[PDB]
Amino acid sequence: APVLSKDVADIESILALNPRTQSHAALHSTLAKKLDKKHWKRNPDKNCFHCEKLENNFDDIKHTTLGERGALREAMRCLKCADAPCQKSCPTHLDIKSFITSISNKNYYGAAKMIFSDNPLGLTCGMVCPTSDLCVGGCNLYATEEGSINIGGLQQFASEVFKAMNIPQIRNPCLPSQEKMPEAYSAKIALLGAGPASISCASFLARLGYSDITIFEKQEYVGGLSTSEIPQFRLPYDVVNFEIELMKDLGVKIICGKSLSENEITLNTLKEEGYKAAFIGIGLPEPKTDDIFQGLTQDQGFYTSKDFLPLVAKSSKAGMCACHSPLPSIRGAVIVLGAGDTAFDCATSALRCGARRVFLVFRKGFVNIRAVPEEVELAKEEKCEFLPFLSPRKVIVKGGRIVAVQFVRTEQDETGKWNEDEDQIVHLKADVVISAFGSVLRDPKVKEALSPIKFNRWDLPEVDPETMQTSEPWVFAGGDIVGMANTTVESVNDGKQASWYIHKYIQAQYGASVSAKPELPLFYTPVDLVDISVEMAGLKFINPFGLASAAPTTSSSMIRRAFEAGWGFALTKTFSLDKDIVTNVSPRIVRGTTSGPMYGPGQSSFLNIELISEKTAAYWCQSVTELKADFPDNIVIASIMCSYNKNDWMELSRKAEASGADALELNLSCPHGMGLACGQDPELVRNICRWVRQAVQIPFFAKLTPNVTDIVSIARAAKEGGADGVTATNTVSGLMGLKADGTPWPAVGAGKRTTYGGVSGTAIRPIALRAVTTIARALPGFPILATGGIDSAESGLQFLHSGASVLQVCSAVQNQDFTVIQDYCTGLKALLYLKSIEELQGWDGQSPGTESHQKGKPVPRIAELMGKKLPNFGPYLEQRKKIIAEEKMRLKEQNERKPFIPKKPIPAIKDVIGKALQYLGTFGELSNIEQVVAVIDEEMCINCGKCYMTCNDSGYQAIQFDPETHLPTVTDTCTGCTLCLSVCPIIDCIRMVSRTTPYEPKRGL
Amino acid sequence: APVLSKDVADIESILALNPRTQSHAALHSTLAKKLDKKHWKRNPDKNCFHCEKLENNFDDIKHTTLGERGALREAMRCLKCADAPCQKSCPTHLDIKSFITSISNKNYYGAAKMIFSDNPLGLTCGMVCPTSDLCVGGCNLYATEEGSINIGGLQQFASEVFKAMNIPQIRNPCLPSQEKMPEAYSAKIALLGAGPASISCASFLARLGYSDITIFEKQEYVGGLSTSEIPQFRLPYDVVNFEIELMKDLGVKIICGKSLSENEITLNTLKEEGYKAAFIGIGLPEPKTDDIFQGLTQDQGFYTSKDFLPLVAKSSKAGMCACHSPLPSIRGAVIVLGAGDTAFDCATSALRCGARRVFLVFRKGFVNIRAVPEEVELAKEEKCEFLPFLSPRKVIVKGGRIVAVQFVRTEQDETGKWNEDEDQIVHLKADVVISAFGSVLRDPKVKEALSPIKFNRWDLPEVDPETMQTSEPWVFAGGDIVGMANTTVESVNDGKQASWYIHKYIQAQYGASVSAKPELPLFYTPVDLVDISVEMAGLKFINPFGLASAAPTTSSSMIRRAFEAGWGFALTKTFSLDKDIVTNVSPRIVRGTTSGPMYGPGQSSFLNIELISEKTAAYWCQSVTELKADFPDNIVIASIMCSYNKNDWMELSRKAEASGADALELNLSCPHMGLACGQDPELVRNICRWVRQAVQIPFFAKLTPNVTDIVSIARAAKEGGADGVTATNTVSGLMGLKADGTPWPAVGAGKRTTYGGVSGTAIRPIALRAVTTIARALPGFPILATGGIDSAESGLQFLHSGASVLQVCSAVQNQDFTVIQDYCTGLKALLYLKSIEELQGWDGQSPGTESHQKGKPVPRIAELMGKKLPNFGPYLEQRKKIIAEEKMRLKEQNERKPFIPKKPIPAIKDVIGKALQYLGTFGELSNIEQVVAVIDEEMCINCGKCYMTCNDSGYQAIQFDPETHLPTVTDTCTGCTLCLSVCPIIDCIRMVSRTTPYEPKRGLP
Ligand SMILES: Cc1cc2nc3c(=O)[nH]c(=O)nc-3n(C[C@H](O)[C@H](O)[C@H](O)COP(=O)(O)O)c2cc1C
């Protein structure tokens, strides 16, 4: 017979690339290394002077785009700062802390709601905001080596998921019915220009209740520059359409083919027609021109950005127009003049039109570029050449075509003045010239249509920077036309700012006043109407979330603020009779070491050696009376503890009941004598519950410790004793760790002493979930208040599904603050709402089904790629690029949005409780016939070989790892243990599927 | 009475910036936002065209430098890939996977050892390698949004900590005594030039045993370009000195003031003197010059990089030269000609000399820049202006000074071909001109000294790319002189490559052969001599680490490979008699959800529903016989399980003993106070009694943590005759449910599951408590620890807790068997460091945390400390001004010895149970020795997490400044320690003895 403990030839071969520590230094010549390097190349090659062909390629090129995997990582990284500087640096004042917290908790709906509440064009902005000069520029994490947070990408991700949910925006639920609205809200309102500014203004006015809002747009398309000029490869047109439809959900009307101009629409005609207010948001309609380009035509090869970009947009944005137009034929060398976003977008867009080479020419130096570094990077990575200190002087035309442009050198003198050197010239060959100096408002007919408002020095409408009001009280203006800023978000903010004062003005015209403090409404959807209340043990909870008896309930003043924030209920820190007064030691609460040396947000656990409340029973009882008086609908549960003494338990419970507590929670941590604690002995628990039951009439719950062999026996004892339910569970006994010198942490006093503490947080969730599930199955219907690692609506729902009715939280608040309640509530509403949407059954909660991707970007479904074994690196990547380019050329030759409606009642909390219990059982109830095997999606793989390493040293050596492509392949020896899927860095790259081939366990002999 | 549940004015004030969800959208004008943005600005302002003052400022400007906090985060992020592409892309073939794994496990020594084993200039390279064109360029994580790993920074960090340990390099321990070495090793060896190439070559030759190695250096200083030209602000001179001294530890001699030149040292004179081999590593000594600069002097303002950089280095690098030297007085506009590293370093260095403005002039375009993006970024961020397509023609000299440089425009045609346009000129004003075209070897005297070796077309020494041998068999060459590459790492590799063939050549000259397979020695230090063996229950373990009975021991072939890797011991997967045969289900092993949606490396836990081994007892017994036959020194423990039956346990135990197992481990998971035998003291006692009377070898009872009192079970096992206990098995739990209520793992069409066992770091607190409580209750009773052991550090925690050996499962599932190397070097280092008196302030391998920002030391300037100047907005501007003034003040103001153990290095037996002295009851903790939190404002990153945690989970004791976002702990602090626990910056907050009167908050008197 064979050497059983040895790998046969076949296995030794499959293990060829398995890591093995070397006993000697390696020997590889420098020449050999130079030759091997190209095979594994992932990033750009600095020695490569030409970037792949991009003709007709409008694929997303943003470096900030995130997929779910990446978004969760980045969201978890965010410090979720107080008085956040990023928010202060955001023109629309987005509550970044809150929306990123929501993303980290997988509550994409809540994140999107927060985003759109302050920015109606939340998705567009996430994609195009020059964050380095805005929110990200103020990020505290810039002070770390890893750097600032990708705020834009996170905003984009949450907004994209919300868009995919196809949920409509609704009228504010707290507004009176449309027919009960004061006459003033029917005032005819007009907005000129359907760009970011007007879309934002109209949206906020609609939120306030105005029912007659009309945006008059000159063109046949809507969205402004977001549609007509920003490239499809930066901002997909479907994003613009999505935001406009959300606005239309509020009743805003849009009429195209209508222009603000003499003989057409004017302020006078609007006033004559009965309009009560007007918002001017027409932007800067004309290109900034240069005399030297006079007379040049497109046929000769000359374009202004205003000519060029819309042509490319109309050809690349399906839905923009009804016309099916061809992409501008740009052949040869292209010269783009300018240093702002316009210039860089013209440069990159020129490449999509077939340009062989592109030159970005600046009048000043590289240091003076106006576009943010991130925008510049897109042109630079696509090999556009930059030529600084250049001023155009002449354009040479031959054979009806531009063939060159002559420039003069420019300089900065000992004064700060820019001069041109006539004797120093440049003759640059070029076939196409695109002027991208910027835009302005010149049309005399448009200016005349704005009579008689005052215009400033810059010949632009003058407005009060705070109210956005022009010299005419009923006319306001915002966006590019005001000339203060040139960003989508600032234009959106201008409309937002204007909406409040337009509201104030209109109300005043109808003899009504408005609050001195601005009150623009938030963003709402049907999800917000979802009822998340629940009844348990005769008590009505407005929502299932509450504060556990712990550090967050150290003082009643804290509970008050928690109720003000929206928490459904709260436990007082555990208190006792005066004779049981205690004194805490310090340090006493430490971070968990359960997930490695990761500091800051999201600690996976905490350990504490804290005692009961140091505050008296008198303080707590009076506090309870105060809290119940001010928050009658918020449930207050008094947590109490006594030694094993009947008179004490009856005295304290009665005192707590007399204070007005809705219920009591009995802390069974007091030692005695099965263990040392009362909560570890069924007999003691039964008696304690009996004493309390005969002492009070209100409901009471026994808080169980997980530190027992059979927690069900304790729960049963409590039930037999008269308890109305149980709280599962308290903290897990443990020792968090020791320093290298052997001393503990926490370390108390000069002696550096410690004692076993209680572990809390996500690290103990598996223990708490098992406890809740086992009790729910053994004692059906017996109320369970869950506690142990609840830190999101998703995790909360897991406990509800496991049999719990309400959810207590401690560690999640210690890791953050009381505002997480907003996230938990919107998150739970969303989870319940989605269960009624038939079209989204493939999603896992708020997570869309994972689509094949790389870096969060969808993988091209080209027949010429699937199954080609072409990883994203080295020569293989070059091949992929060639195939994609050919596909784009092939697509070139070859030349609606409805909201989902619930198709079933939205489940209430009571309808989901215990629903997961049906899947639990004994091991014997599990099928050993229905086996599975792992299957890898090569298109999502990042070639790390972790699946391979795990199967090799922790599995069945069933994966082949290719030595050239670093692509893994699961073979037929797979047993479906699932370890590979469990260690894979890419979500859903590996999936377990039903085994189709014969299965037979490996018996060795 | 007052309203107890309400915050008084004072507290309401302190809570002013505490987060509170808003009920309405915010209103802030665009103008207001523009004005407020500047206050919080962290990153560079794109509108700022003037670079900060950098005169005489040589502070580290590398973006890759990491501090411990940052290094740990990045190391944990690394996928630690199989057949890693980063290593393949590293010229010295560094085992990046392994050294980064060591860093993630806090084993900086092991990381440094791995680095230096393949690269003698590991620290220099970590700091200067153009990683984007090397290792990082092939990083698999480039395929994720977050991007590739900062490999260089990690290498730099580990190497810096090692440098701080001040541990010397030693001769290979396995080499024969110096006196027993064959005569061949005394062969006189000469190396020319003390740069990276020669330092590397000499180092490896010394490792091989050569005792007469001399490097002859022309200059008075050593280190080559690392010393003479690379800026101090990129590569501190102390780094070079450190690596030089490590080499000298091996006996290599360096003689300065000796040149390879016709009238001095020549190949002929060396041969005449008896030298047996010579390595030429003199680099490229002369600057590449241009005819137009002929005659220009430094006084006129002209320098070549070879003139300039050494001048700056000599004045900025303390220790480089004997006497002090002044910083070149560079005033006015500076023109730097070139596009490689040389040019960019000249540009940045010019600013340190006082340059007002710097222009980098390129003959080609920006796209053609030779330096990697990361090098270019340093000059660009310092506002250097770049002028492309420029070729110098004349240096206008008036009044004995350069006043300008006249250039001609350049361009590229059809076949690339570079032309110069004579009619297109530029007259650029400048006061200083620095040519940085590169370097060459031209000195006829030096070339003649190399007679008669063959030179190639490039007039450089010709060498075989594989052996580095010249036309003369006894002469080799490497580094810049060969002209193949221009990087420190490639030069180091050239010397490394040459060392093996020099060795082969010398041995052959003495009539000795060498292995066909290259065998360069690894890097060693005294730490490697540390004994980590331990004896337990009469068994001798070569090291305390072993594989737990689990997935990593699924097959005996795997245990074999584990022993080959170096694991001290291993458990077989639990096996039973034929009648108890089982069949596993699938899926059965899933990742933990204990630390959020973080995928890939370092899962914080796993859950499994796996059964005992599916392989027969016959297979395992034969396997044990085989394993013990081949690995007699590695301990093999047979894990067995039977139902509650005497005959069965006696039969199986005897069968396992007969196979040759060193010991047995009894799995007490079989259902027979719970449902398992391990949960009942009576059953455990009996089972152990049966086995005790059946076998003579030692046996250990594996305890389950799922019990009220684990000590009672351990005691039962001891009373039953067990020789020790294994604490502990997995924790019972449910890892989680999907949003639809289905579990994971989900088995079969019914998507069923059952309670599984949780393993990994998430259960370490439970296992640590178990080990410590058992160790305290049963002094001296052997304990084998299991539960979250994933590093030498964590292993030491268990040893300190009372365990003698350490079992591992999850850490291997997360990686592979090679972690054993990390654990062993890590434990050796931890024990070694305990003997170093000067490092007592360190926590294990972690140096005391110094005040820093982004890992860089905070300047200790009197006008900075206590100024309340955070690192953002106007405050940052002030800080920079203060620092610049300090640098000017410093301008106004014109040995490395190894630590020696001063106590015996502790053996494992000396550390076991040392932590027990600190554990006790809560009553044994002092409630009088209280502490309070103290924040180091210089380390703060202004997130406000301490503030939020104290507000909603504490005592509202922290003031958070509304302008500086700096926190201040007030006297109401109770020392609970939550703030310190949530702070993202390691050691920013520290707990200190309270000095002011302490009185517990009672709420009511
Ligand atoms: C997939 C898997 C299989 C296991 N199989 C066994 C087994 O057969 N016998 C046993 O005594 N313990 C078994 N264990 C438990 C381990 O030996 C070890 O006690 C546990 O995982 C705790 O250590 P860790 O934190 O290093 O993983 C298993 C654990 C896992 C994850």
- The CATH number linked to A462 is 3.50.50.60
| Ligand 1 pocket test target in B620, B725, B759, B812 with most atoms within 8 Å of CB | B759
Q: From B402, B398, B480, select the one nearest B435 (Cα to Cα).
A: B402
Ligand 1 atom having least distance to the Cα of B789:
26
Contacts (Cβ under 8 Å, ≥6 apart) of B660: B624, B625, B628, B629, B636
Q: From A68, A163, A112, select the one nearest A856 (Cα to Cα).
A: A68
- What residue in B sits closest to A628 (Cα-Cα)? B5
Residue B528, classed as helix, strand or coil, is helix
For A126-267, list the strands marked E by DSSP. Answer: 189-192, 213-217, 253-256
- Report d(CA B750, CA A723) in Å as an integer: 35
- Report d(CA B941, CA B554) in Å as an integer: 48
Q: Which residues of B are annotated as a binding site?
A: 78, 81, 86, 90, 128-129, 135, 139, 155, 193-197, 217-225, 234, 260, 339-342, 363-364, 370, 436-438, 479-488, 549, 573-574, 608, 667-669, 702, 729-730, 760, 786-788, 809-810, 940, 943, 946, 950, 973, 976, 979, 983
Beta bridge partners of A287: A439
Q: From B382, B231, B237, select the one nearest B309 (Cα to Cα).
A: B231
With an 8 Å Cβ cutoff, are B520 and A749 in contact?
no
Ligand 1 and B548: CB distance under 6 A:
yes
- Report d(CA B665, CA A930) in Å as an integer: 32
Bridge-based pairing of strands B189-192 and A333-337 is: unpaired
CB-based burial, B284-300: b 16+ in 10 Å, e otherwise: bbebbeeeebeebeeeb
Q: What is the DSSP string of B10-44?
A: HHHHHTTTS----SSB----HHHHHHHHHHH--S-
Chain A nearest C-alpha distance from B504 (Å)? 14
Q: Which of A140, A562, A953 sits opposite B941 (nearest CB)?
A: A140
Q: Token pair of B232, please?
A: 């101090």
Chain A nearest C-alpha distance from B58 (Å)? 20
- Which helix (H) or strand (E) segment holds residue A637: the answer is strand A635-640
| Ligand 1 pocket test target in B545, B611, B730 with most atoms within 8 Å of CB | B730
CB-based burial, B638-656: b 16+ in 10 Å, e otherwise: bbbbbeeeeebbbebbebb
Contacts (Cβ under 8 Å, ≥6 apart) of B248: B254
CB A109 within 8 A of CB A98: no
A361 phi and psi angles, rounded to 5 deg: -105, 125
With an 8 Å Cβ cutoff, are A611 and B743 in contact?
no
Find the CATH number of the domain harbouring B667: 3.20.20.70
Residues from chain A that touch B769, judged by Cβ atoms under 8 A, are: 733-735, 756
Ligand 1 atom having least distance to the Cα of B607:
31
Structural domain includes residue B134: yes
With an 8 Å Cβ cutoff, are B1001 and A942 in contact?
no
Co-location of A607 and A743 in the same domain: yes
Chain A nearest C-alpha distance from B811 (Å)? 10
First to last CA, chain A: 10
Structural domain includes residue A604: yes
Co-location of B262 and B293 in the same domain: no
Task: Give the number of other Cβ atoms within 10 Å of residue B447's Cβ.
Answer: 18
Q: A838, A853, A887: which is the final residue of a domain?
A: A838
Q: A386, A406, A439: which is the final residue of a domain?
A: A439
The answer to whether the annotation marks A642 as part of a ligand binding site is no
Residues from chain A that touch B118, judged by Cβ atoms under 8 A, are: 25-26
Q: Which of B708, B765, B800 sits opposite A742 (nearest CB)?
A: B800
A256 phi and psi angles, rounded to 5 deg: -90, 165
Ligand 1 and B553: CB distance under 6 A:
no
Q: Which of B583, B843, B1001 sits opposite A615 (nearest CB)?
A: B1001
| Distances B431 to A636, B331, B359, B400 between C-alpha atoms, Å | 79, 7, 11, 11
Residues from chain A that touch B1003, judged by Cβ atoms under 8 A, are: 555-556, 615-616, 618-620, 623
Find the CATH number of the domain harbouring B152: 1.10.1060.10
Residues from chain A that touch B588, judged by Cβ atoms under 8 A, are: 976-978
Residue type, A121: L
Q: Which of B19, B584, B872 sits opposite A817 (nearest CB)?
A: B19
Find the CATH number of the domain harbouring A998: 3.30.70.20
Co-location of A537 and A526 in the same domain: no
Q: Which of B27, B708, B1003 sits opposite A520 (nearest CB)?
A: B27
Q: B152, B182, B212: which is the final residue of a domain?
A: B182
Co-location of A510 and A542 in the same domain: no
Structural domain includes residue B871: no
With an 8 Å Cβ cutoff, are B758 and A752 in contact?
no
The answer to whether the annotation marks A224 as part of a ligand binding site is yes
The rounded Å distance from CA B786 to ligand 1 centre is 9
Structural domain includes residue A890: no
Resolution (A): 1.6
Co-location of B168 and B113 in the same domain: yes
Co-location of B601 and B537 in the same domain: yes
Co-location of A448 and A346 in the same domain: no
CB-based burial, A895-923: b 16+ in 10 Å, e otherwise: eeeeeeeeeeebbebeebbbbbbebbeeb
CB-based burial, A137-160: b 16+ in 10 Å, e otherwise: bbbbbbbbbbbbbbbbbbbbbbbb
Q: Token pair of B196, please?
A: 């990276």
The answer to whether the annotation marks A22 as part of a ligand binding site is no
CB A659 within 8 A of CB A639: no
With an 8 Å Cβ cutoff, are A762 and B595 in contact?
yes
Q: How was this structure determined?
A: X-ray
Atom 12, ligand 1: residue with shortest CA distance: B549
Longest dimension (CA), chain A: 109
Q: From A269, A100, A914, A21, select the one nearest B87 (Cα to Cα).
A: A21
Atom 10, ligand 1: residue with shortest CA distance: B549
With an 8 Å Cβ cutoff, are B30 and A91 in contact?
yes
- Report d(CA B980, CA A585) in Å as an integer: 16
Co-location of A168 and A201 in the same domain: no
Ligand 1 and B760: CB distance under 6 A:
yes
Ligand 1 and B810: CB distance under 6 A:
yes
Q: How many structural domains compose chain A? A: 5
- Report d(CA A984, CA B332) in Å as an integer: 57
**Which member of B346, B621, B670, B677 is catalytic?**
B670
CB B992 within 8 A of CB B934: yes
Residues from chain B that touch A760, judged by Cβ atoms under 8 A, are: none
Domain of residue B389: give its range: 287-439
CB B130 within 8 A of CB B487: yes
With an 8 Å Cβ cutoff, are A583 and B1000 in contact?
yes
Best residue in B6, B88, B981, B987 to probe A by mutation, most A CBs within 10 Å? B981
Co-location of B571 and B635 in the same domain: yes
- What residue in B sits closest to A172 (Cα-Cα)? B24
The rounded Å distance from CA A955 to ligand 1 centre is 13
Contacts (Cβ under 8 Å, ≥6 apart) of A758: A607, A608, A609, A730, A731, A732, A733, A734
Ligand 1 atom having least distance to the Cα of B763:
25
CB B787 within 8 A of CB B764: yes
Structural domain includes residue A844: no
Co-location of A367 and A381 in the same domain: yes
CB A439 within 8 A of CB A283: yes
Best residue in A108, A121, A169, A586 to probe B by mutation, most B CBs within 10 Å? A586
Residues from chain A that touch B930, judged by Cβ atoms under 8 A, are: 585-586
- Report d(CA A982, CA A954) in Å as an integer: 12
Structural domain includes residue B577: yes
- Report d(CA A77, CA A746) in Å as an integer: 26
Best residue in A17, A594, A616, A819 to probe B by mutation, most B CBs within 10 Å? A594
| Distances A848 to A88, A408, B491 between C-alpha atoms, Å | 32, 56, 51
Structural domain includes residue B845: no
- Which helix (H) or strand (E) segment holds residue A71: the answer is helix A68-77
Chain A nearest C-alpha distance from B244 (Å)? 19
Best residue in A428, A595, A992 to probe B by mutation, most B CBs within 10 Å? A595
Co-location of B338 and B456 in the same domain: no
Q: From A268, A304, A264, select the one nearest A446 (Cα to Cα).
A: A264
Which runs of consecutive H residues, i.e. helices, occur in B707-762? 710-719
Ligand 1 atom having least distance to the Cα of B729:
19
Structural domain includes residue B869: no
Residues from chain A that touch B749, judged by Cβ atoms under 8 A, are: 927, 930
Co-location of B484 and B553 in the same domain: no
The rounded Å distance from CA A89 to ligand 1 centre is 51
Q: Token pair of A767, please?
A: 């223990």
With an 8 Å Cβ cutoff, are B585 and A67 in contact?
no
The answer to whether the annotation marks A128 as part of a ligand binding site is yes
CB B370 within 8 A of CB B380: no
Let me know how long chain A is: 1005
Vertex B668 angle, CA B774 and A789, to 5°: 70
